[PDB]
Design a protein around this nucleic acid. Structure first.
Ligand SMILES: [K+]
Ligand SMILES: [Mg+2]
Ligand SMILES: [Mg+2]
Ligand SMILES: [Mg+2]
Length: 134
RNA sequence: ACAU
DNA sequence: CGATGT
């Protein structure tokens, strides 16, 4: 199996897990950063991975692009397929922001359509995803 | 076990 | 070493 170079790759970065969460999307071929989310004070790795995919979907749909999205997160890929982020993170004042973003991402999935293939980046074969936070 |  | 997830 070969890398689909005409694609968008996304990844999360964090300081702590749970901790400060950010994510970005890059052109898989060139590494050009196409979007980056301002750090969110408290979230989980998987919430960030999920938000990154959904933002990718919205970014590609707005631009009428049929490119696939790569993510290395088995969890987030499934959450997007289910349109449901099954996170364990407590809901409190500290986590309100990330939970609002997650709820709104689910809502977007439940009110829009897309054909974008969401593909597993095969880290064991190909190395780190091109959006990785080194 | 697998993926982060 | 710890945590998030299927
Ligand atoms: K585990
Ligand atoms: Mg990742
Ligand atoms: Mg990474
Ligand atoms: Mg890392």
């Amino acid at each position: 199996e070969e890398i689909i170079w005409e694609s968008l790759s996304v990844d999360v970065g964090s300081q702590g897990n749970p901790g400060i969460v950010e994510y970005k999307g890059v052109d898989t071929k060139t590494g050009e950063v196409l979007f980056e989310r301002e750090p969110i004070p408290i979230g989980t790795n998987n919430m960030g991975e999920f938000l990154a995919i959904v933002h990718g979907l919205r970014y590609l749909k707005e631009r009428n692009s049929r490119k696939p999205i790569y993510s290395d997160s088995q969890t987030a890929i499934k959450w997007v397929k289910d349109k449901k982020a099954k996170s364990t993170l407590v809901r409190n004042e500290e986590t309100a922001l990330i939970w609002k973003l997650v709820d709104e991402a689910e809502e977007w999935l439940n009110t829009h359509t897309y054909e974008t293939p969401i593909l597993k980046w095969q880290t064991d074969k190909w190395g780190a995803i091109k959006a990785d936070y080194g």
